[PDB]
Design a protein around this ligand. Sequence first.
Ligand SMILES: N[C@@H](C(=O)N1CCC[C@H]1C(=O)NCc1cccc(Cl)c1)C(c1ccccc1)c1ccccc1
Ligand code: NA
Ligand code: NA
Lengths: 11, 250, 31
Amino acid sequence: DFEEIPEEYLQ
Amino acid sequence: IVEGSDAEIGMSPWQVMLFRKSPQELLCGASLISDRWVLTAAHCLLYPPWDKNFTENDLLVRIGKHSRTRYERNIEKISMLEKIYIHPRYNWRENLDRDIALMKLKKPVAFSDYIHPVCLPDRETAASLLQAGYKGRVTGWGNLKETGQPSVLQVVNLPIVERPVCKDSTRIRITDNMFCAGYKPDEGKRGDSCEGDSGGPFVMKSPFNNRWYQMGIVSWGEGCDRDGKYGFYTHVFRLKKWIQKVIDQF
Amino acid sequence: EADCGLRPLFEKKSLEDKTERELLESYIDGR
Ligand SMILES: N[C@@H](C(=O)N1CCC[C@H]1C(=O)NCc1cccc(Cl)c1)C(c1ccccc1)c1ccccc1
Ligand code: NA
Ligand code: NA
């Protein structure tokens, strides 16, 4: 339901 | 938030979203109190009855947001957590007494038109304003009704309730570390926090210095917006000695 | 912060939000 956040924050 | 309205842009620039990394989902609200410190409810992070025990690496905070679900490019900022601190006498077993936690960010966040810290109350501002009938304001992205979810941040203004009325509304043991707020059944206005608003701020605008202060943290309720029930909020001033000790030491 | 509680888009520009007056009107102390 949420727009994917940028991959950099999931490192 | 039940029976609230859409927030204005920049209305609550201390609002923080606690966000789970995997699955990606909203976990709670929170508030920005400095460039590296975020305040929330302890039960957002630790609640054994529901098998909840989040660690730093499970979570992000999202600051400057308005839309619940959108990635607000060039507006919101996403921060990783260095460390979680839960009040050492947080009572998750019984009644959520001392429902407060701090999160230190890995790096300071840059302030902007959309990102700005709220004040914490001094003793005198708290004494002047934490009085029955005086209204505060709650913001959050939680559910719109008990039994559904908002497009954008919601806001509701609610009156603080007399302590005997709070006590007489519930079977939970209430403590001096809590206050309750909401309209009474006869009053013709309504509103409450709800699931997903946990950890967000109950704020009041001082008429003495025209600054916003965080008096409460969204803590607990029985259902949402039920007649004769009230929302309960962590009493931030009563726990400020602990807040100050953590920030000074860490 | 020395600047806490003053919103860039409201207090810092002397603009009021649409319901803050509701809060003020409830505050008896000190007037
Ligand atoms: N409904 C429970 C509660 O509020 N909980 C459970 C843990 C997290 C918390 C919660 O859902 N908070 C969000 C919320 C919802 C509505 C209004 C507000 Cl202000 C906040 C509450 C409660 C349970 C049964 C009977 C009365 C009260 C509770 C109280 C103390 C201890 C255990 C359960
Ligand atoms: Na009771
Ligand atoms: Na109610």
